[model samples]
Target: MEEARLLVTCPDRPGIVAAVSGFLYAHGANITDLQQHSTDPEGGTFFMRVAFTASHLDLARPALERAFQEVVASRFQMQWRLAYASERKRTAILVSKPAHALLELLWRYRVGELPMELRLVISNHPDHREEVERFGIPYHHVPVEKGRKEEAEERILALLEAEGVELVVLARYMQILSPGFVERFPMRIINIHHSFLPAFAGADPYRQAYERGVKLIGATAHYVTEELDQGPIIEQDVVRVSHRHSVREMKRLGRELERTVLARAVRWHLEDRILVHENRTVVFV
Candidate 1:
């Protein structure tokens, strides 16, 4: 049977499940999986992701979407999208000298945890070409000279378009992309930032945290926007730290946080379990 998935988010209220399930059941759709969550204290919002099979349904994609819209909008004032399971998202990964995060993503892809196809890997340095190509993924080396950052961005976007990439993962890509390039991709770009955010934002965030004697260090995986790490955060995790920990210990702990947080964000994205709301993310984990 043909399968489909629907992602929905709206203000938290009663009867949301009943309305959604009743509509799908009436339309001959069977729910395969449903996950939902409501944020703490903030009872104004709710999020849901539903995976279903509609092969037995008499309605087409457009019809089903229209019908769902009619029922949801009037009943719940919700925002939603219906995605066909057959459509595979193509992702282009961007990386620099640091290959830890990139390697983790590659491993997930190899193990079938990431559902989207990795179309290519773009890097500013050619040093990782052999390692990247060893995984059977195409690698593009585009060097960005100092003071020519804008030109480099233009080339990157051009490559992204040529590769037909639907999503971009900045897997520890060291370069801070120009605002112009960020505007092109908008929320389509995901980045793994090494710090807990709003604490240590710019370069060497982990090192900065160590110097500041922070009690905790963490990583954040988020959609890239014009404001650096201030984009919609999809996932974040922290590790315990203390005055007894050295800078080296902090760096090691940060690496562990980065891997776990980035992996979760990528998984949620591939599964369509994340939705953007304002500058925050609604993740139905």
Candidate 2:
């Protein structure tokens, strides 16, 4: 059976849902789940995530897309994309020293918890080479040498292009990706900020949290925009903390949060459950 998700974003107007559903039904698609949101009922943005089974469709997938674009999507001026469940996204992971989040993703993928194709793992250090290769995944070590950061980025860009990676996850990758590098991926790259975002952003966030004596610590998973951790957030969560905990202990606990939050964000992306809206997100789940 053909299971697919359609993500649509456009200006709010009358008959949007009716038109979309009518078109799907006409094409013999069985609508399974649909979720929609409007910023304002009158003259605002509209977003929708719809799932359907197209096993009995009269048209092939490409033909269906063309027909939909010509009939329903064009009328509404919608920005829409259709993703099939069978075609898993080709994903890559970039890491540096910390291995908790990377290991969690690998473990999840190993157990079929995440629906994606884990193509390869790239690292600035060769620390996790053996562990990653043991899973039968290719590992590439492209070190960021002194003053030649551009060369390192070039190599990474080449690898990403050669592998045709659809998504990139920064699993505690310690380097600040160049603006040029970030531009190439746009919203396709996900990063786990080690703090509650907007608060303890950038480096040494745990140290900042320890000094500030915050009552709660957290992690943020967001798309990597050119402006660093200020991209549209996909997910965030916090865990309670107290003054009794030292910086080391706080980091230890935060790592746990990081792994889960990043995994959830990645899963949502893979499931086509998230829609980026300006500086935020409208997640179906």
Candidate 3:
């Protein structure tokens, strides 16, 4: 079957689903997957992702788009894109010392669990070069010394642009990005915070959580912005903990959640299931 995916985002209004579904139905398209969401109670914004197979329709993408232009303009003032399923986004993964999240993302991509082309892995430390290269992906060691931070960030941006990276994944990358660097990528960069945000934001979050006697430990995957981990959250999940657990145990459990949550966020982003709202994410899944 000829399969295509459609992504739509716009101001919220009634009948969005009906209009979209009706258009696909009229074109003899069979909906294989569909997800939609509204941002808040006021419904100021909306996002939708739909995958369908159009075996019977002879329409090309341009024709299909043209056919729906009137509806899109008249209904919700939507912006949309239609693409074949085989197209994949190029991604660059950044890590410092930890390789847990990086390894998980690579494994999932290899097994077809995520739809992305692993372009390269950039790290401040060179220890993981051999392991990262074993997967046939290039690894760049761009060290940031005390005075060379500016140059290092510029080099990173150069690599991102040179490789045409659609997304930047910070999979346990330990260094704090400069505000200038964050502004360069804006929402294009995604980072996995070791703990549930706003709870233990600063350094050694696991140890902080353990000391605070928190009953639950979690991980957050969010867009990287100028505000550090305060970016719009994309995915988060938690595991229960107890007073008996040590900091080491909390760290171990937190790593597990971090890997899972980060992978989910990357998958959703590559699949075009996430839409950036004002300061948060409106995930269609």
Candidate 4:
């Protein structure tokens, strides 16, 4: 059955759920799954997601949106979007040299585990051309030279625009995106950090972890904001580490964590299972 996901965010109040479900029922939509969360359940922020069969809907996509906008959405003053499962999001992956996370995404996308249109892979170096192209996806190399980062970003921005890319995933892309570049795609860019963010955020997280003798090392996947690694986190996971592990060993383990964590974040974003609320995220998975 064809499916569509409806994601919503608004002020918490009475009759929201009943209104939404009732509206869908009236439109002949069979709701497959529904999840909601309220920060206070009284008067705080509310987040909700619904996946339903779009094939049987009485109203078409445009008409449904128009009706929802007039009826349920406007009444609640909600911010929402409807995403169809068949209309996969056009995505671009940005990487520098490290290919662990990037390769994992490529393989998963190739295997149909990720329901996204892998439009292109943008890199600052020419390292992964052959590998990326082997999957039949176009690879673009836009080098960020010394003191010319903005020019490089401009070229990338142009490429992404020309490709009609909707999502940008940084799989260990080494450059710090300029604020102007980050502004181009607010909440649409995702990056994987090597450490359990807010801990060893900046340069070398594995080395910082080893130096601190931390018992656990982790990775975080988050939306890219102008504040560097301080964006809204979408997914994270950690692995056990001990004194026996060296900095090199910790990095090896961290790569595994990064691959999985970033994949989950991208998957959730593609499925419309994540709602950005304040400085955090309400992930329904």
Q: Provide C-alpha RMSD values for all models, in order.
A: 3.2, 1.9, 2.7, 1.8
Report the C-alpha lDDT of model 2 over 169-204, residue by residue, as the tens digit. 999999989999999997899999666533864568
**Candidate lDDT (C-alpha), each:** 0.83, 0.91, 0.84, 0.90
TM-score of candidate 3 on Cα atoms, chains taken together: 0.87
Model 1 regions lying over 4 Å from their true place = 1-3, 11-16, 36-46, 56-59, 70-77, 196-198, 201-205, 212-215, 227-229, 241-246
Candidate 1, residues 1-285: lDDT per residue as tens digits?
666888888888888888999899988888999988776435677778899997644448788888888877557878887876567789999999887888889988999888888889999999788988999999999998999887888888888898888889998898888778888887888889766534865667777777777888878899988864478989888999998888888888887788778878988888788888779987776
State residue 256's C-alpha deviation in candidate 1, in Å: 2.6
TM-score of each: 0.85, 0.95, 0.87, 0.95
Model 3: per-residue Cα lDDT over 155-266, one tens digit each: 9889988999978999989877889887777678998976653476567878777777788987889998896348899998999999877889888888888999999999
Q: After superposition, how far is residue 282 of candidate 3 from its true place, in Å?
A: 2.6
Off by over 4 Å in 3: 39-43, 56-59, 183-186, 196-198, 201-203, 227-229
Evaluate model 1: give its lDDT: 0.83
Candidate number achieving the greatest lDDT relative to the actual structure: 2
Clashing pairs in 1: none
What shift in Å separates residue 103 of candidate 3 from its native position after superposition? 1.5
Residue 223 shift from truth in candidate 3, angstroms = 1.2
Tens digits of per-residue lDDT for model 4, 84-159: 8888999999999899999999999999999999999999899999999999999999999999987998999999
Where's the lowest-lDDT run of ten residues in candidate 2? Answer: 194-203
